[PDB]
Amino acid sequence: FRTFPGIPKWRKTHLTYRIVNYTPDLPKDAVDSAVEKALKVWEEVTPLTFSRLYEGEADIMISFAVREHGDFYPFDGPGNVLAHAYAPGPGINGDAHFDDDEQWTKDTTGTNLFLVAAHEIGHSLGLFHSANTEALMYPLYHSLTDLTRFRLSQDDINGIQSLYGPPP
Numbered sequence: 001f002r003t004f005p006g007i008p009k010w011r012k013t014h015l016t017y018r019i020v021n022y023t024p025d026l027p028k029d030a031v032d033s034a035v036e037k038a039l040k041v042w043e044e045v046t047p048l049t050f051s052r053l054y055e056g057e058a059d060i061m062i063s064f065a066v067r068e069h070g071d072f073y074p075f076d077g078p079g080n081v082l083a084h085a086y087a088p089g090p091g092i093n094g095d096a097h098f099d100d101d102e103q104w105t106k107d108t109t110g111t112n113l114f115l116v117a118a119h120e121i122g123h124s125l126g127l128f129h130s131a132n133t134e135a136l137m138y139p140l141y142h143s144l145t146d147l148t149r150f151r152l153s154q155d156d157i158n159g160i161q162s163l164y165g166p167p168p
């Protein structure tokens with residue numbers, strides 16, 4: 001696994017998140033379901049807990065946008081960058097942005113929102129890109145022959161427990 005330069009990480013285990021807006025591609029309840037599941041993948045193997053806010057500034061502000069959207073890294077239309085996220089820290093740090101020029105899905109038919117969100121949350125928690133082809137944090141998108149098979153690799157678990165420890 002890799003961490004970011006200087007190893008920034010949250011200095012607390014109870015984190016907040018806010019879904020600021022929604023992609024047209026799925027029902028809101030599906031987006032909420034995909035986001036909750038992506039957070040739980042990391043909650044289950046650490047002491048971290050995520051609490052949903054509906055207004056104000058959460059630690060992890062999740063939003064969907066296209067092209068230029070208020071940071072130094074514009075999106076780029078369909079394909080290429082799918083989303084991006086910032087390492088732990090205040091303000092824009094920790095936030096996750098999803099390119100709404102992608103087609104977001106709940107399955108294998110497009111760009112799986114759960115999958116990509118799970119990878120971005122890794123970044124929001126302090127993990128960079130792994131060299132392991134089976135890691136969730138490996139930098140190469142691939143959807144899945146059955147999502148029910150999905151499992152964090154040991155490389156992802158060890159990265160995240162190195163920063164935050166195992167569940168108490």
Ligand SMILES: CC1(c2ccc(Oc3ccccc3)cc2)C(=O)NC(=O)NC1=O
Nearest residue numbers: 081082083084116119136139140141142
């Ligand atoms: C290219 C890239 C990305 C995003 C989500 C991914 O989801 C995965 C990761 C591994 C396996 C299957 C899906 C993969 C790459 C990635 O490297 N980093 C990222 O933050 N956004 C991106 O678009």
Ligand SMILES: [Ca+2]
Nearest residue numbers: 077079081099
């Ligand atoms: Ca894109």
Ligand SMILES: [Ca+2]
Nearest residue numbers: 059091093094
């Ligand atoms: Ca933030």
Ligand SMILES: [Ca+2]
Nearest residue numbers: 100101102103
């Ligand atoms: Ca879209």
Ligand SMILES: [Zn+2]
Nearest residue numbers: 071073084097
């Ligand atoms: Zn952005």
Ligand SMILES: [Zn+2]
Nearest residue numbers: 119123129139
């Ligand atoms: Zn990545």
